[PDB]
Design a protein around this ligand. Structure first.
Ligand SMILES: Nc1nc2c(ncn2[C@@H]2O[C@H](COP(=O)(O)OP(=O)(O)OP(=O)(O)O)[C@@H](O)[C@H]2O)c(=O)[nH]1
Ligand SMILES: Nc1nc2c(ncn2[C@@H]2O[C@H](COP(=O)(O)OP(=O)(O)OP(=O)(O)O)[C@@H](O)[C@H]2O)c(=O)[nH]1
Ligand SMILES: Nc1ncnc2c1ncn2[C@@H]1O[C@H](COP(=O)(O)OP(=O)(O)OP(=O)(O)O)[C@@H](O)[C@H]1O
Ligand SMILES: C[S@@+](CC[C@H](N)C(=O)[O-])C[C@H]1O[C@@H](n2cnc3c(N)ncnc32)[C@H](O)[C@@H]1O
Ligand SMILES: C[S@@+](CC[C@H](N)C(=O)[O-])C[C@H]1O[C@@H](n2cnc3c(N)ncnc32)[C@H](O)[C@@H]1O
Ligand SMILES: C[S@@+](CC[C@H](N)C(=O)[O-])C[C@H]1O[C@@H](n2cnc3c(N)ncnc32)[C@H](O)[C@@H]1O
Ligand SMILES: [Mg+2]
Lengths: 288, 1057, 378, 76, 50
């Protein structure tokens, strides 16, 4: 509570200034996702240290990405569409070839040690039984083990999948910079001088058959009830390397539709492009 | 000294170790040592731990395994306090033992070790292709030619570049890095040009003018803000470096142009690039604030984007439109040439314009860091003004400026116990004089004394005046900080007056330490306490002058005749605790125990006697003058009969009361009472209350009656004022050259842009004006300025309104103060007594001068720095003849003031006095122009010459100030003279050389012999009140004691023709 | 280049900090009240000091670690000028405290830390004015231009001017300004210590003539230079005092302090930047001044010492460890050795002796060594 | 916590400080030198956590707290 | 308001009662289990109250 009051007196959100300094609101408001395209950012993820609120900041460090920023090189070589001047994708974990220890897993190890200290302090403050407390610690170290056991499958296998999916043709936007503190998606719109503009990214409330809601709980099956071909060592599944064509063709098809789809509108609006006009008076300054 | 002198070197390459040093680079054997291996610091205000490794480890990527170490758990372990050095060292050491970089040691002496790639590989735990290359072929890290060290990993891996994450310098923070450094395989200048060109086709990238290991590297930023902070820090680095290069000092710059070059960035970074390349004068002057560097930098660009200068504007614009080009001065460029000469294959940024810098003459004053500026405003300046707009000053919060009533008096403790004497002068008391003085005393009693004097006496209380000092002695004694002092010493008495508990020495010159857990309450004191103590000290100094111990003799007694709680009796009783057998008792009509309660005169049955008495009787009841007179008479009578050394108070010390007291003592059978008037420094500075000192002596006292005594003049000259007292205003509107302001002080704030104008206007009134901003962020500048009557009397002589506005604008914005702490101004500032006497004499002479008709000019000989300017009316011309006066021909011509600037000759024939002129000789006759003392016969001689010289004149008026001899008789017997002295029979006021004094009788006799009209006048109480009310001055205690006896013995001869 | 490279502040810094470090540990104890060691102590720490008795500073209160006194480049110099005036009022003095009821002015001012240090050094002396007075002055110092405004009254028993216009200006204006500054400095005090930024014979003699022009006083004068000045500065402090006698021989001609400035003139050549050499050629005589610095395989070390004898008079060497075969070598180049060795083409050396050193006979040092490009000499 | 004895100065200071860090009044800083800040209404709004109509007015328009003429500060 | 003052007051009230019931619990040497159970019920009342 005390650290909380010190944190939230600063503000629930902040805005990066044109000069680059953060400017916290000084207000305690609930976040809405309408704010996601706004100038504001959630303040938990500012990574700006604050006196007397060090515990909150240190806990907030645990949300830091462990990935890397791969440039989408094959997509450039293929001349695929890319909204950015320098296309890039944040790939969540590095391949960990040949190492006895897995860095993605060791990070989760330190994270869990921190949570152990935190849940320990909360446990002793609430005078709860030693039994349940050690049971919490036991479940934590179990999560640690499960995490190593699948960490191999994520870092050395899912990562190559992310690395190729980054180069697919229709994956045109940059997804994330790896900096929660400052990232906001580039916000293009289709402006017209004689109309109202359409943002490409909008909170328009179309749900795309539920694709927009995010069940974070999905992590539990991942850590705890799924097999992976690498995780399975010792049976050997042999990795699948899917034919490009099946997605490539799909991309083409889409790109081919939405290409010509706008043509008649484009042609007429080309014709009438010079046709808007302003009323003007012409005063005569001299005789005849 | 135009050409730069510098030794550029790849410092980063020098940091990389030989392969053989890599094994021991951790120094596994020994603990890391502070200031050599590491640099820990805890900022308690920020509560932020900061560790920073030295040597090669200053560049060190950490594996998550390395971040799992307890060392990094430490800052969380100690949220509010410094990590104890033992834990810091042990964890830092065990973690150092934890690290082992891959290497292949070799015997070649040309070899180095690629520290960056090795620590990086280790940090990624050798998973990256570089980490693979290193884990399989560690020898690849070793290198001769620095560039090849990377070419070797570029060829072997087949990649065009490697993206190395940057390191945070403070190993504790785990925050995501702002950017990262890509490293390119571009051995040739051509390959570099191509990479730079392609880099200008992509978002958020920048690079240095030159690169380490001669290998091209580019920074890629995660956001615009990260790019801005980076460019800013680099601009500061380049500006500091160039600031050093331009001083002609040799520099070990690692690179000639430290600042970054955008290849692609937003508007704002292009602005930073532009003002960065400009090297604006404003940086050197510290006009910018570095607390929020980039912000100021952006603002600076905003000025340059629309700069008043054409050259600087077009230059900034041109730099903004070609951000990719690296603008640099010719003097940098020659250094780049020397670098390319020493290393023919050095790479440096190819797109580069060479501009000649634009000079600017405006030397701004500035100083970030605490301290208000105390300006001394000039009366005039190069700037002219015409109908300046009124300048409103803002309301100030008490968070910034508080306005206490009276300045507390800092002083030495001994100074509190001083007193001055005034011996009787008249040998007889004629009956007609008795009727005159009685009529005077009755008329003066029936109508109350001056209301202004009452206001000052009731505002400047001595108790508050002493309070900060008396408490301070208590605060030190409470902490045990006090130690050594003599038994009878005044410091000891001050200690007894500061604490309620009994004190005791453990030995000579050493007070006993406080018992544990004991914190005794401060002694309770009323307003008359310190005064009563000082009167006791006075009696101790009167029984024998040479004494240092102030303890009462054993088997002796004292009485404090006026009493209530009378704390002084308790303090005195405790001060003398170590002396055997001593009565000490108060005895008021309102007295509470210990003091006996009793009326005076004493009841005929009761027996009261003592070796000393200190009466302080004062009837609160309003009463007839005859009853007040009979009561005070009976009180002095019983006080004198009861003791050999009475120290009676006299509430209304008219000549009549005191002389009636002397006559009454004359009437007592068989004893002859020597007497002297007295005034201690612990009295309220403005009180006219005086203590007569009665003692018996075997001889009859020649000259026992008083006439025109100083202490008496302090009271008798005061009379009911025609006007209401001048209450000190706080002014908030600075009108341009208005002359309407009542005494008080300007106080408020303005936007810092308007500040130079404000100082430009208040020069008309205030002589000097403290100013300050509260913080670097808040633009308002606070300003306080007491109104000087002398500055008004100077500035308003003519309608011209010149000022040094052009200079004051050199202050904005950093050049006029910074102070976070709240400041405390007083409505009544302290001034030394001599200064007060000066202002009093000025009020006397000025009031005297305004009365005279038809005088063309005031000639103030020996006028120094126009000190007498307050006296002269704004209409008539002023003249100075002090050799020491500085000449200001513009100020003189503009303000109607001639200055002779020559030593005035006192010979009568050489002298030429104009008719219709007022000749001031205020304290000039007593000194030679060179400052050596002139012997008194020469002073009476020169006064005689000024007298004879003006005999021919039709209308002329001299004012010759001098020092009367009687004061040396009185100061020899007094104690309260911290300023005035008596070195071998001569007065020694202030820092001035000792100077012999004239006798008034011989002077007046000589003037009667000359036959010129003369009138020996001295400033009185109303002049004092006018001085203090006008200048905003509180008198102060030593001043209150010494001012009566000092003022009376600086007669002002008034020659008139 | 030398004046701007060899700053006095850095030259003194290790020493002034050391007094702070000892005082912080409480290791310092005994020193006299007026002593110079005491003044150095006041210049080393921001906190007010106080003796508990004769020759004994008070122990620090528990938990208290006061910040070091902040000093600019001219600080120690201003202190040393104050000491100079103290030694000029009477030479025999050991106490440097100002007399009670006396005053000093540091006429050039900004933050002027020296005013604060001096004010704290004299804390135990009763009644003493101590104030700076620059055009850029911040409080405590009054901000004011010189010559003083005709209204304001300024006087002291001592003055230490350090006025120096940053602005580039005409010689006539620099001359008139420095003249007026010496004039007001002399008129205001019995013991002025004015700075002279450009001490040509003409400037100083014009100052003497100007003091001659003032009515009724005869000014004895002397040029001066404190040890706290930057070693290469030609800036000189004239010392003005009045004496009853006329001063025989008052003008300067071919004075030393003046020669330090006047003989200096713009050089035909660029300044000689000190190189670090890394190739030891055999008897070559091409080397610019600087120093050889590097390492060789220990087998080749006797050869290296054999060759650098041609240039360097002497050469420190050491291996870093018993395991690492490279021997580091540092050797400043002596012009005298070049002037000797190169008189003839013969190239004899004690190589046969130097080979008796390999491998253990030429140094061991784990600790990092620190060489300077500009070594001290008496 | 300390029924019978003085709160030790360290605890008093540390709690008073952390609580001072806890407070943040709404305001709109401005360059006018005539301006003041309506301390009463701001601390009140904050104390009610901006639920009262004054607290609403302040949470939406902090600038209303700034004032030149003292009376108008409330008239507003 | 994100926080409800009427509820936060009940929060401080409950913290006080926690200290009180804690002192009474340790004075009567009752089991740690029941004691923490009292605290648990208290924080539950806290939640319901919000
Ligand atoms: N990870 C890692 N980064 C390095 C190393 N050496 C240099 N760098 C980084 O490479 C970048 C480019 O090097 P520099 O030319 O020295 O740039 P710089 O900003 O002037 O570096 P500073 O000395 O900190 O001012 C810097 O930002 C460093 O952070 C290293 O050994 N390891
Ligand atoms: N909540 C709150 N109350 C205030 C504030 N300022 C003044 N008051 C209250 O308003 C009442 C009227 O103000 P005043 O005219 O100063 O009355 P007062 O009784 O003389 O106040 P005192 O200075 O304590 O004697 C006082 O009782 C104060 O308690 C404020 O900033 N906040
Ligand atoms: N400091 C500057 N340097 C160069 N160009 C500028 C600068 N300020 C504004 N501009 C020009 O004006 C445009 C921006 O307009 P404007 O100044 O109104 O808003 P801004 O970008 O916030 O800048 P400012 O902060 O100066 O208002 C930019 O496209 C730029 O070309
Ligand atoms: C000005 S007070 C000073 C007393 C003492 N210095 C003190 O304050 O502790 C003088 C006191 O003497 C008392 N007093 C007045 N006239 C007296 C008299 N005629 N005889 C005895 N006491 C008298 C008054 O009651 C008054 O309180
Ligand atoms: C005490 S100061 C000024 C006193 C007073 N405040 C005033 O202005 O008249 C006296 C000055 O007079 C000057 N002076 C002394 N003797 C003089 C003389 N014989 N002729 C002209 N000026 C003289 C000295 O330079 C000295 O500074
Ligand atoms: C070389 S600095 C030394 C000042 C002081 N020793 C210090 O650094 O704290 C001299 C200062 O005097 C100021 N100054 C220059 N000319 C002046 C003048 N004519 N009158 C008053 N001050 C001047 C300048 O602003 C400069 O900052
Ligand atoms: Mg660098």
């Amino acid at each position: 509570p005390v650290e909380y009051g010190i944190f939230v007196q600063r503000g629930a959100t902040y805005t990066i200034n044109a000069a680059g300094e953060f400017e916290f609101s000084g207000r305690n408001e609930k976040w809405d996702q309408a704010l996601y395209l706004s100038e504001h950012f959630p303040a938990l993820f500012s990574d700006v240290p604050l006196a007397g609120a060090n515990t909150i900041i240190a806990i907030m460090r645990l949300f830091t990405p462990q990935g890397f920023l791969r440039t989408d090189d094959l997509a450039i070589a293929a001349n695929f569409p890319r909204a950015s001047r320098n296309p890039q994708t944040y790939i969540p974990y590095t391949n960990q070839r040949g190492t006895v220890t897995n860095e993605f897993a060791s990070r989760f190890r330190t994270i869990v040690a921190t949570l152990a200290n935190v849940v320990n302090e909360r446990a002793v403050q609430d005078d709860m039984q030693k039994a349940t407390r050690s049971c919490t610690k036991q479940w934590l170290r179990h999560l640690e083990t499960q995490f190593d056991n699948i960490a191999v499958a994520h870092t050395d296998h899912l990562s190559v999948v992310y690395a190729t999916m980054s180069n697919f043709m229709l994956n045109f936007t940059n997804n994330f910079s790896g900096n929660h503190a400052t990232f906001k998606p580039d916000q293009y719109v289709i402006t017209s001088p004689e109309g109202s503009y359409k943002p490409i990214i909008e909170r328009q409330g179309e749900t795309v058959d539920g694709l927009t809601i995010i069940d974070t709980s999905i992590v539990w099956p991942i850590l705890c009830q799924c097999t992976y071909p690498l995780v399975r060592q010792s049976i050997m599944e042999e990795i699948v390397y899917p034919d490009p064509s099946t997605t490539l063709s799909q991309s083409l098809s889409v790109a081919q539709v939405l290409s010509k789809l706008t043509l008649p509108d484009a042609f007429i609006n080309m014709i009438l492009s010079g046709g808007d006009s302003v009323v003007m008076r012409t005063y005569q300054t001299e005789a005849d | 000294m135009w050409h730069y002198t510098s030794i550029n070197n790849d410092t980063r390459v020098a940091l990389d170790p030989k392969p053989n040093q890599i094994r021991t680079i951790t120094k596994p054997n020994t603990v890391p040592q502070l200031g050599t291996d590491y640099l820990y610091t805890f900022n308690s205000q920020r509560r932020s731990h900061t560790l920073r490794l030295l040597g090669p480890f200053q560049y060190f990527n950490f594996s998550e395994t390395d971040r799992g170490h307890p060392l990094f758990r430490l800052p969380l372990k100690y949220p509010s306090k410094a990590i104890p050095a033992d834990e810091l060292i042990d964890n830092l050491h065990s973690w150092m033992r934890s690290v082992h970089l891959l290497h292949v040691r070799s015997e070649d002496n040309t070899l180095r070790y690629n520290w960056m790639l090795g620590v990086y590989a280790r940090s990624t735990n050798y998973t990256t292709p570089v980490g693979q290359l290193v884990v399989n072929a560690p020898a690849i890290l070793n290198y001769s030619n620095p560039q090849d060290a990377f070419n070797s990993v570029f060829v072997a891996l087949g990649i065009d570049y490697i993206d190395i994450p940057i390191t945070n310098s403070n190993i504790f923070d785990d925050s995501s890095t702002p950017y990262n450094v890509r490293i390119w395989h571009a051995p040739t200048m051509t390959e570099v040009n191509h990479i730079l060109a392609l880099m200008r086709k992509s978002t958020l990238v920048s690079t240095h003018s030159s690169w380490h290991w001669n290998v091209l590297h580019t920074f890629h930023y995660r956001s615009e803000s990260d790019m801005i902070d980076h460019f800013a820090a680099k601009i500061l680095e380049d500006w500091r470096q160039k600031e050093k290069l331009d001083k002609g000092a040799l520099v070990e710059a690692d690179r000639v142009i430290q600042r970054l070059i955008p290849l692609s960035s937003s508007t704002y970074v292009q602005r930073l690039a532009a003002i960065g390349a400009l090297y604006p004068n404003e940086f050197t002057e510290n006009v910018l604030d570095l607390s929020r560097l980039s912000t100021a930098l952006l603002q600076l660009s905003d000025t340059y984007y629309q700069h008043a200068n054409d050259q600087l504007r077009r230059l900034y614009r041109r730099m903004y439109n070609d951000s990719r080009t690296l603008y640099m001065t010719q003097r940098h460029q020659e250094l780049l040439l020397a670098q390319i000469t020493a290393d023919p294959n050095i790479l440096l940024y190819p797109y580069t314009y060479i501009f000649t810098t634009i000079p600017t003459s405006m030397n701004y004053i500035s100083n970030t860091g605490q301290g208000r500026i105390k300006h001394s405003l000039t009366v005039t300046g190069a700037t002219e003004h015409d109908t300046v707009a009124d300048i409103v000053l803002g309301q100030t919060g008490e968070d910034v400026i508080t306005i206490s009533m009276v300045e507390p008096m800092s002083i030495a403790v001994e100074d509190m116990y001083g007193y001055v004497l005034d011996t009787p002068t008249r040998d007889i008391w004629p009956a007609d004089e008795q009727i005159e003085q009685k009529g005077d005393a009755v008329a003066l009693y029936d109508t109350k004394t001056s209301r202004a004097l009452g206001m000052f006496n009731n505002t400047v209380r001595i108790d508050d005046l002493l309070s900060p000092l008396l408490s301070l002695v208590y605060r030190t004694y409470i902490k045990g900080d006090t130690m050594t002092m003599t038994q009878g010493s005044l410091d000891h008495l001050t200690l007894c007056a500061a604490v309620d508990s009994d004190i005791t020495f453990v030995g000579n010159r050493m007070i006993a330490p406080l018992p544990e857990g004991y914190i005794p309450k401060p002694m309770h004191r009323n307003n008359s306490t310190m005064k009563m103590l000082s009167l006791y000290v006075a009696l101790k100094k009167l029984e024998n002058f040479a004494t240092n111990s102030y303890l009462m003799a054993p088997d002796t007694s004292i009485i404090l005749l006026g009493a209530e709680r009378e704390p002084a009796v308790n303090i005195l009783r405790r001060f003398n605790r170590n002396v055997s057998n001593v009565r000490i008792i108060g005895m008021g009509d309102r007295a509470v125990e210990p003091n006996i309660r009793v009326r005076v005169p004493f009841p005929i049955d009761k027996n009261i006697s003592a070796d000393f008495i200190i009466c302080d009787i004062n009837s609160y009841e309003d009463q007839s003058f005859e009853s007040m007179f009979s009561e005070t008479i009976s009180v002095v009578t019983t006080c004198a009969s009861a003791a050999t050394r009475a120290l009676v108070k006299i509430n209304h010390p008219s000549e009549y009361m005191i002389n009636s007291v002397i006559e009454r003592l004359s009437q007592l059978g068989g004893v002859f009472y020597h007497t002297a008037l007295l005034k201690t420094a612990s009295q309220n500075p403005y009180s006219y209350e005086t203590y007569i000192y009665i003692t018996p002596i075997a001889a009859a006292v020649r000259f026992p009656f008083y006439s025109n005594s100083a202490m008496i003049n302090r009271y008798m000259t005061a009379v009911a004022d025609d006007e209401m007292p001048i209450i000190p205003s706080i002014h908030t509107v600075i009108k341009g050259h208005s002359n309407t302001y009542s005494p008080g002080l300007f106080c408020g704030c303005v936007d810092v842009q308007s500040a130079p104008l404000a100082l430009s206007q208040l020069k008309s009134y205030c002589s000097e004006a403290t100013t300050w901003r509260v913080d670097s962020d808040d633009n308002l500048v606070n300003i306080i300025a007491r109104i000087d009557p002398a500055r008004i009397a100077l500035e308003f002589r003519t309608r011209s309104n010149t000022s040094a506005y052009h200079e004051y604008q050199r202050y904005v914005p950093n050049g006029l103060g910074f102070k976070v702490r709240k400041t405390r101004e007083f409505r009544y500032m302290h001034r030394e007594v001599t200064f007060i006497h000066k202002l009093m004499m000025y009020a006397l002479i000025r009031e005297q001068i305004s009365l005279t008709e038809n005088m063309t000019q005031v000639v103030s000989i020996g006028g120094r720095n126009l000190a007498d300017i307050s006296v002269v009316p704004l209409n008539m011309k002023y003249v100075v003849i002090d050799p020491a006066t500085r000449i200001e021909t513009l100020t003189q011509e503009k303000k109607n003031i001639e200055v002779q600037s020559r030593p005035f000759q006192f010979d009568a024939a050489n002298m030429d006095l104009e008719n219709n002129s007022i000749y001031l000789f205020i304290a000039v006759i007593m000194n030679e122009p060179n400052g050596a003392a002139t012997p008194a016969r020469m002073q009476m001689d020169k006064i005689r010459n000024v007298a004879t010289a003006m005999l021919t004149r039709t209308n002329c008026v001299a004012y010759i100030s001098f020092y009367e001899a009687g004061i040396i008789t009185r100061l020899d017997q007094s104690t309260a003279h911290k300023t005035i002295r008596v070195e071998e029979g001569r007065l020694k006021v202030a820092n001035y050389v000792p100077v012999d004094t004239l006798v008034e009788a011989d002077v007046t006799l000589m003037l009667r012999d000359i036959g010129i009209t003369h009138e020996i006048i001295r400033p009185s109480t109303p002049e004092l009140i006018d001085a203090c009310s006008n200048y905003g001055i509180r008198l102060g205690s030593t001043g209150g004691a010494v001012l009566d006896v000092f003022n009376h013995y600086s007669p002002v001869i008034k020659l008139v023709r």
